[PDB]
DNA sequence: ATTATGACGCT
DNA sequence: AGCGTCAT
């Protein structure tokens, strides 16, 4: 009743660019502009692995985890661009530094959490106290929300998509109470009014386009980002959630894409989200924990407190690469000569993150898979980082692994590595 | 023979 | 600390 706290407290955006990767190439590149595009990491092996799809490309079934010379049997025409290799390896340089040109543009609206490489969940609580006080009180023009979608909208009482949208929003906007300064829906109102305004100044600043999501917390901001792309935004009410959930398989929730929401399926026998919410809070912590437990029972209500983080720089710097079948690493000077490669590239990247952010790494990371294991990682080890010196790293992160190799012969290795990676971690301000 | 990352939870 | 999960 009036004590049940909603979960309607902050307004949080997440704005996600579309097919990332593919917009950077398609900027330094305009003959791939408005094209089925794709991006690829190598080229010799299935014609390189694609990791980032134009839309127009989607059209065609064009996927991420496709190999090339499979995508141009859907896609004859498909255009291709591919990652720059240094050092033998994949280098992703490009679009870190496309990704910092757009992190600091949405840092001038609000303070930013980086949650991945083309994405950022922003708290725009106070931006929308603060231009509620501003507006004083006038409604809110359809005109400020021109790639805005309603999510449940338009309902009741019509065959184009932008005439969908507008009606949806039509109606929202005449359902609302603008003398309210702490209605909800207000709020969320004028936070997508802002991100607007903070997704044309990305695409007006660097080129790019980008999808956003407007609710009350991180969970359902990134949800609402996925329903309408490319190049639109999408606010999802607190009273949208009954709804929304009634049909949302449960993996489509962020954290519920693997074995822990399989399991909510299978324990449970239920489909659906919304189906969540016939479980006492202790019933799901006996299933599932006492976190997972009560994070679930306030989340399938669409409630969840997960702050949006003051962090606009990752916490940790890492190089990897896969030896995959054949090119295993099978002798001492193999691995050393790659450990020294990664260690190149990342001697780079701290040193610049250095000069730029004011910060040290003190933890090298150094990790392994061995042929035969199919986990992810085989070991991880970590050492001292005390100096940004390639040389002394690689061979540090050898003294930590050579324990690994079980051959009696000095020069050969076995198993052979089938992976290697090197991470900097536990920065401290310099 | 997907690949290259990055965050966070558990014990 | 080292391992697992999730994301993609
Ligand atoms: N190296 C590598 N990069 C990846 C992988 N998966 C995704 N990326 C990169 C390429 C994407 O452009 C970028 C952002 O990922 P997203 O999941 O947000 O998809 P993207 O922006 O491509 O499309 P979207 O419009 O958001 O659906 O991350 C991967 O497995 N390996
Ligand atoms: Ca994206
Ligand atoms: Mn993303
Ligand atoms: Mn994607």
Same mark, same amino acid.
């Given at each position: ?70 995508? %141009? ?6 255009? $291709?661009? @591919?990652?720059?290799? *240094?050092?033998?390896?994949? &280098? /992703? =340089? ?66 184009? %998509? ?6 949806? $929003?039509? @109606?929202?906007?005449? *359902?609302?109470?603008?003398? &309210? /300064? =702490? ?248």
């Amino acid at each position: 009743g009036p004590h049940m706290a909603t979960g309607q407290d902050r307004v949080v955006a997440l704005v996600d660019m579309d097919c990332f990767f593919v917009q950077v190439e398609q900027r330094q590149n305009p003959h791939l502009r408005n094209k089925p595009c794709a991006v690829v990491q190598y080229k010799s092996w299935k014609g390189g692995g694609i990791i980032a799809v134009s839309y127009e490309a989607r059209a065609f079934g064009v996927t991420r985890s496709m190999w090339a010379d499979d995508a %141009k049997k859907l896609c004859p025409d498909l255009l $291709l661009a @591919q990652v720059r290799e *240094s050092r033998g390896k994949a &280098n /992703l =340089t490009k679009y870190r530094e496309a990704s910092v040109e757009v992190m600091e543009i949405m840092s001038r609206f609000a303070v930013i959490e980086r949650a991945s490489i083309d994405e950022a969940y922003v708290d725009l609580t106070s931006a929308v106290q603060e231009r509620l006080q501003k507006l004083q009180g006038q409604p809110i023009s359809a005109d400020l929300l021109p790639s805005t979608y309603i999510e449940g909208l338009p309902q009741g009482p019509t065959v184009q %998509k932008e005439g969908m949208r507008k009606q949806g $929003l039509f @109606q929202w906007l005449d *359902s609302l109470q603008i003398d &309210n /300064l =702490t209605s909800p829906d207000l709020q969320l109102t004028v936070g997508a009014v802002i991100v607007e305004e903070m997704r044309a100044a990305i695409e007006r600043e660097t080129g790019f386009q980008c999808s956003a999501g407007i609710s009350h917390n991180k969970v359902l901001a990134k949800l609402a980002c996925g329903l309408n792309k490319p190049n639109r935004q999408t606010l999802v009410s607190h009273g949208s959630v009954p709804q929304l959930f009634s049909q949302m398989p449960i993996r489509k929730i962020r954290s519920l894409g693997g074995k822990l929401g399989a399991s909510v399926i299978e324990i449970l026998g239920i489909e659906y989200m919304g189906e969540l919410t016939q479980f006492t809070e202790s019933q799901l912590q006996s299933h599932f924990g006492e976190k997972n437990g009560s994070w679930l029972y306030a989340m399938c209500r669409g409630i969840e407190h997960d702050p949006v983080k003051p962090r606009q720089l990752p916490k940790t710097i890492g190089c990897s690469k896969n030896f995959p079948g054949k090119t295993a690493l099978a002798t001492r000077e193999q691995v050393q000569w790659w450990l020294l490669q990664l260690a190149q590239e990342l001697e780079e990247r701290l040193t610049k993150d250095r000069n730029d952010n004011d910060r040290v790494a003190t933890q090298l990371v150094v990790s392994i898979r061995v042929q035969g294991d199919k986990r992810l990682s085989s070991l991880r080890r970590c050492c001292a980082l005390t100096r940004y010196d390639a040389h002394k790293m690689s061979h540090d992160a050898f003294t930590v692994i050579k324990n690994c190799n079980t051959s009696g012969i000095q020069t050969e290795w076995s198993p052979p590595l089938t992976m290697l990676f090197l991470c900097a971690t536990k920065f401290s301000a310099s």
